Amino acid sequence: SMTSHSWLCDGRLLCLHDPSNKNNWKIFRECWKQGQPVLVSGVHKKLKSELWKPEAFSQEFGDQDVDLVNCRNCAIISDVKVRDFWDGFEIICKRLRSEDGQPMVLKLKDWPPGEDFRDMMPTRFEDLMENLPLPEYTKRDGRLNLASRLPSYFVRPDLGPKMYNAYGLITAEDRRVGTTNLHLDVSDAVNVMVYVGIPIGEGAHDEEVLKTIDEGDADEVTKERIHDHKEKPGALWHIYAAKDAEKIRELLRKVGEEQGQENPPDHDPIHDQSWYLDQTLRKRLYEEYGVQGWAIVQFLGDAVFIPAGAPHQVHNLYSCIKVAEDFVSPEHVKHCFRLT
Numbered sequence: 001s002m003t004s005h006s007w008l009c010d011g012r013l014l015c016l017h018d019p020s021n022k023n024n025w026k027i028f029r030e031c032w033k034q035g036q037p038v039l040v041s042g043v044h045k046k047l048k049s050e051l052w053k054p055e056a057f058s059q060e061f062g063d064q065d066v067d068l069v070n071c072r073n074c075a076i077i078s079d080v081k082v083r084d085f086w087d088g089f090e091i092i093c094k095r096l097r098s099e100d101g102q103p104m105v106l107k108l109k110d111w112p113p114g115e116d117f118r119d120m121m122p123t124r125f126e127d128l129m130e131n132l133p134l135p136e137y138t139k140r141d142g143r144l145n146l147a148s149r150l151p152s153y154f155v156r157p158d159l160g161p162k163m164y165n166a167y168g169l170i171t172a173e174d175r176r177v178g179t180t181n182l183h184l185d186v187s188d189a190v191n192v193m194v195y196v197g198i199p200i201g202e203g204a205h206d207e208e209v210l211k212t213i214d215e216g217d218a219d220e221v222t223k224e225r226i227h228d229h230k231e232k233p234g235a236l237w238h239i240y241a242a243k244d245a246e247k248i249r250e251l252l253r254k255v256g257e258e259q260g261q262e263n264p265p266d267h268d269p270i271h272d273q274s275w276y277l278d279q280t281l282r283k284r285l286y287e288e289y290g291v292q293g294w295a296i297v298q299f300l301g302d303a304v305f306i307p308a309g310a311p312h313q314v315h316n317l318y319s320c321i322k323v324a325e326d327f328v329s330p331e332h333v334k335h336c337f338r339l340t
């Protein structure tokens with residue numbers, strides 16, 4: 001039977017089921033005020049699916065010059081055509097290869113660049129912005145988005161949205177690598193999964209995805225969406241409460257020292273965006289510092305709401321297209337204030 005919502009992550013994660021319901025705010029706002037992330041399912045059913053295909057991006061924009069990142073070793077591939085990324089998104093035999101002869105796991109850096117999404121892609125901009133959940137919070141001019149209303153005493157987000165495109169991580173060794181390393185943002189954000197590409201070539205790669213979700217500490221209800229409903233899983237997130245950010249800095253300064261890094265005692269390993277918390281480091285955070293987090297699997301059409309100041313990391317299970325909008329809720333405006 002159809003329901004307004006469910007509770008995931010041992011009752012700590014709200015999952016809203018109807019992305020456009022005019023009553024969603026009544027369920028959302030108490031979870032949000034407590035500094036929790038929120039998930040909203042079903043946004044893909046509201047969008048024009050033809051606008052969000054990898055082959056369309058290659059056809060329309062493929063002669064633009066871009067830089068790529070090799071997710072395995074952080075090497076930068078400079079000044080290549082964006083078609084060289086898009087044409088290997090789902091077809092493994094078309095992917096750029098490393099010196100060892102293997103196909104690379106690539107991330108497309110800063111594309112569209114800076115604030116240019118709306119100018120470059122006006123039909124995509126309209127389709128996303130008109131279908132964002134919790135629109136009083138997430139639209140540029142929503143009544144509960146303070147972004148356009150604050151003075152210079154507050155850090156204001158850039159004009160959005162921003163697109164995040166990267167291949168899926170594949171191997172047992174890849175389990176310890178991030179798509180996006182641990183970091184935080186001083187603004188709130190909503191991140192929508194608009195497309196998931198499950199390949200052919202090395203295709204039949206299902207078992208390493210299940211071990212990644214299990215070892216990732218997914219809850220048993222999330223482990224049912226995999227097996228029961230046959231939805232496409234895109235990415236595994238870990239999110240930590242803003243109140244636990246300094247305890248995470250203390251762990252990563254200790255581990256940096258154990259690994260012979262030579263950092264000053266006040267340096268900021270979260271701002272550096274250089275760490276991915278693997279199973280070993282997540283268990284040490286829990287056991288040695290008493291800090292737990294939310295393990296979230298983002299399926300096609302899921303919107304993840306990330307509270308301002310909350311440390312988070314992302315690991316793609318399959319090839320993903322994500323689109324994110326930043327906003328400034330009144331609940332979390334303290335995190336962007338420039339004094340005290």
Ligand SMILES: CS(=O)(=O)NCCc1ccc(F)cc1
Pocket residue numbers: 097098099100101102
């Ligand atoms: C430019 S590179 O990143 O150093 N790679 C070496 C070139 C290559 C690697 C694998 C091939 F199947 C063909 C050529």
Ligand SMILES: CS(=O)(=O)NCCc1ccc(F)cc1
Pocket residue numbers: 009010012217218219241292293294295296
């Ligand atoms: C591993 S999980 O299935 O995501 N459940 C964790 C929920 C939780 C989140 C944050 C906390 F500070 C304490 C508990």
Ligand SMILES: [Cl-]
Pocket residue numbers: 035242309331332
């Ligand atoms: Cl907060």
Ligand SMILES: [Cl-]
Pocket residue numbers: 120121122123124125
């Ligand atoms: Cl467009």
Ligand SMILES: [Cl-]
Pocket residue numbers: 025133134135136137
């Ligand atoms: Cl709303």
Ligand SMILES: [Cl-]
Pocket residue numbers: 179180181273
């Ligand atoms: Cl990163």
Ligand SMILES: [Mn+2]
Pocket residue numbers: 183184185312
């Ligand atoms: Mn972020």
